[PDB]
Subunit: 42 residues, 4 copies
Protein backbone atom coordinates (compact mmCIF):
# COMPACT_ATOMS: atom_id res chain seq x y z
CA UNK A 1 0.00 0.00 0.00
CA UNK A 2 1.88 3.11 -1.19
CA UNK A 3 5.17 1.22 -0.73
CA UNK A 4 4.85 0.67 3.05
CA UNK A 5 8.66 0.28 2.98
CA UNK A 6 8.87 3.64 4.75
CA UNK A 7 10.09 3.72 8.38
CA UNK A 8 11.23 0.39 9.84
CA UNK A 9 8.41 -1.43 11.69
CA UNK A 10 8.80 -2.95 15.19
CA UNK A 11 6.77 -4.92 17.77
CA UNK A 12 6.17 -4.61 21.53
CA UNK A 13 4.61 -7.02 24.05
CA UNK A 14 1.94 -5.35 26.25
CA UNK A 15 0.70 -7.22 29.34
CA UNK A 16 -2.97 -6.82 30.32
CA UNK A 17 -5.86 -6.58 27.83
CA UNK A 18 -7.25 -3.25 29.06
CA UNK A 19 -3.76 -1.73 28.78
CA UNK A 20 -3.38 -3.17 25.26
CA UNK A 21 -6.51 -1.42 23.96
CA UNK A 22 -5.19 1.80 25.50
CA UNK A 23 -1.78 1.64 23.79
CA UNK A 24 -3.41 0.61 20.49
CA UNK A 25 -5.47 3.82 20.68
CA UNK A 26 -2.31 5.92 21.08
CA UNK A 27 -0.69 4.21 18.08
CA UNK A 28 -3.81 4.78 15.95
CA UNK A 29 -4.05 8.37 17.22
CA UNK A 30 -0.52 9.27 16.08
CA UNK A 31 -1.06 7.39 12.81
CA UNK A 32 -4.21 9.49 12.29
CA UNK A 33 -2.23 12.74 12.66
CA UNK A 34 0.63 11.43 10.52
CA UNK A 35 -1.97 10.24 7.98
CA UNK A 36 -3.27 13.83 7.84
CA UNK A 37 0.15 15.22 6.86
CA UNK A 38 -0.12 13.04 3.73
CA UNK A 39 -2.93 15.26 2.39
CA UNK A 40 -1.83 18.04 0.01
CA UNK A 41 -1.47 21.31 2.03
CA UNK A 42 -4.42 23.73 1.67
Amino acid sequence: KKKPLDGEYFTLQIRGRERFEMFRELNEALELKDAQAGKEPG
Copy 2:
Protein backbone atom coordinates in the same frame (compact mmCIF):
# COMPACT_ATOMS: atom_id res chain seq x y z
CA LYS B 1 9.26 -16.24 36.80
CA LYS B 2 6.64 -16.16 39.58
CA LYS B 3 4.21 -17.98 37.25
CA PRO B 4 4.04 -15.26 34.56
CA LEU B 5 0.69 -16.88 33.61
CA ASP B 6 -1.00 -13.79 35.06
CA GLY B 7 -2.79 -11.39 32.66
CA GLU B 8 -2.90 -12.45 29.00
CA TYR B 9 0.01 -11.01 26.97
CA PHE B 10 -0.42 -9.28 23.58
CA THR B 11 1.70 -7.63 20.85
CA LEU B 12 1.48 -4.36 18.87
CA GLN B 13 3.33 -3.16 15.76
CA ILE B 14 4.80 0.36 16.15
CA ARG B 15 6.07 2.17 13.04
CA GLY B 16 9.12 4.44 13.41
CA ARG B 17 12.12 3.68 15.65
CA GLU B 18 11.99 6.89 17.69
CA ARG B 19 8.30 6.25 18.40
CA PHE B 20 9.07 2.65 19.40
CA GLU B 21 11.56 3.69 22.10
CA MET B 22 8.92 6.13 23.39
CA PHE B 23 6.15 3.52 23.70
CA ARG B 24 8.60 1.02 25.24
CA GLU B 25 9.31 3.61 27.96
CA LEU B 26 5.59 3.92 28.75
CA ASN B 27 5.23 0.13 29.00
CA GLU B 28 8.26 -0.10 31.31
CA ALA B 29 6.99 2.88 33.32
CA LEU B 30 3.62 1.24 34.07
CA GLU B 31 5.36 -2.09 34.75
CA LEU B 32 7.59 -0.24 37.25
CA LYS B 33 4.56 1.08 39.15
CA ASP B 34 2.77 -2.27 38.96
CA ALA B 35 6.02 -3.94 40.08
CA GLN B 36 5.96 -1.68 43.15
CA ALA B 37 2.49 -2.89 44.20
CA GLY B 38 4.07 -6.37 44.51
CA LYS B 39 6.09 -5.21 47.54
CA GLU B 40 4.51 -5.94 50.94
CA PRO B 41 2.66 -2.77 52.14
CA GLY B 42 4.56 -0.72 54.75
Copy 3:
Protein backbone atom coordinates in the same frame (compact mmCIF):
# COMPACT_ATOMS: atom_id res chain seq x y z
CA LYS C 1 -16.97 27.59 19.91
CA LYS C 2 -19.82 25.10 19.39
CA LYS C 3 -20.72 25.47 23.09
CA PRO C 4 -17.43 24.14 24.51
CA LEU C 5 -19.47 23.40 27.67
CA ASP C 6 -19.14 19.70 26.80
CA GLY C 7 -16.98 17.49 29.05
CA GLU C 8 -15.51 19.16 32.15
CA TYR C 9 -11.99 20.54 31.53
CA PHE C 10 -9.03 19.94 33.88
CA THR C 11 -5.32 20.85 34.22
CA LEU C 12 -2.12 18.90 34.98
CA GLN C 13 1.39 20.06 35.89
CA ILE C 14 4.12 18.38 33.77
CA ARG C 15 7.76 18.73 34.87
CA GLY C 16 10.43 18.97 32.15
CA ARG C 17 10.00 20.84 28.85
CA GLU C 18 10.78 17.90 26.55
CA ARG C 19 8.21 15.80 28.42
CA PHE C 20 5.64 18.61 28.14
CA GLU C 21 5.85 18.73 24.34
CA MET C 22 5.42 14.94 24.33
CA PHE C 23 2.24 14.95 26.46
CA ARG C 24 0.84 17.90 24.48
CA GLU C 25 1.21 15.77 21.32
CA LEU C 26 -0.81 12.94 22.90
CA ASN C 27 -3.57 15.36 23.93
CA GLU C 28 -3.70 16.86 20.41
CA ALA C 29 -3.58 13.35 18.90
CA LEU C 30 -6.67 12.16 20.80
CA GLU C 31 -8.41 15.48 20.11
CA LEU C 32 -7.68 14.92 16.40
CA LYS C 33 -9.40 11.51 16.46
CA ASP C 34 -12.28 12.82 18.57
CA ALA C 35 -12.52 15.80 16.20
CA GLN C 36 -12.94 13.31 13.33
CA ALA C 37 -15.98 11.68 14.96
CA GLY C 38 -17.67 15.10 14.69
CA LYS C 39 -17.81 14.75 10.88
CA GLU C 40 -21.07 13.34 9.48
CA PRO C 41 -20.61 9.56 8.87
CA GLY C 42 -19.96 8.60 5.22
Copy 4:
Protein backbone atom coordinates in the same frame (compact mmCIF):
# COMPACT_ATOMS: atom_id res chain seq x y z
CA LYS D 1 11.44 19.75 48.88
CA LYS D 2 15.05 19.06 47.81
CA LYS D 3 15.08 22.42 45.99
CA PRO D 4 12.29 21.62 43.49
CA LEU D 5 13.86 24.38 41.35
CA ASP D 6 15.06 21.64 38.99
CA GLY D 7 13.48 21.42 35.51
CA GLU D 8 10.98 24.16 34.62
CA TYR D 9 7.37 23.15 35.42
CA PHE D 10 4.45 23.58 32.96
CA THR D 11 0.67 22.99 32.78
CA LEU D 12 -1.68 21.39 30.22
CA GLN D 13 -5.48 21.44 29.92
CA ILE D 14 -6.99 17.94 29.42
CA ARG D 15 -10.64 17.67 28.36
CA GLY D 16 -12.69 14.74 29.72
CA ARG D 17 -12.38 13.35 33.27
CA GLU D 18 -11.62 9.75 32.28
CA ARG D 19 -8.85 11.00 29.99
CA PHE D 20 -7.46 13.20 32.78
CA GLU D 21 -7.02 10.26 35.18
CA MET D 22 -5.25 8.40 32.35
CA PHE D 23 -2.73 11.18 31.64
CA ARG D 24 -2.16 11.72 35.37
CA GLU D 25 -1.16 8.04 35.61
CA LEU D 26 1.43 8.48 32.84
CA ASN D 27 2.89 11.54 34.58
CA GLU D 28 3.09 9.68 37.90
CA ALA D 29 4.52 6.62 36.13
CA LEU D 30 7.44 8.56 34.61
CA GLU D 31 7.96 10.41 37.91
CA LEU D 32 8.16 7.01 39.62
CA LYS D 33 10.95 5.86 37.28
CA ASP D 34 12.74 9.21 37.52
CA ALA D 35 12.30 9.05 41.31
CA GLN D 36 14.09 5.68 41.24
CA ALA D 37 17.18 7.16 39.54
CA GLY D 38 17.54 9.37 42.64
CA LYS D 39 18.47 6.31 44.74
CA GLU D 40 22.21 5.66 45.12
CA PRO D 41 23.27 3.02 42.51
CA GLY D 42 23.68 -0.52 43.90
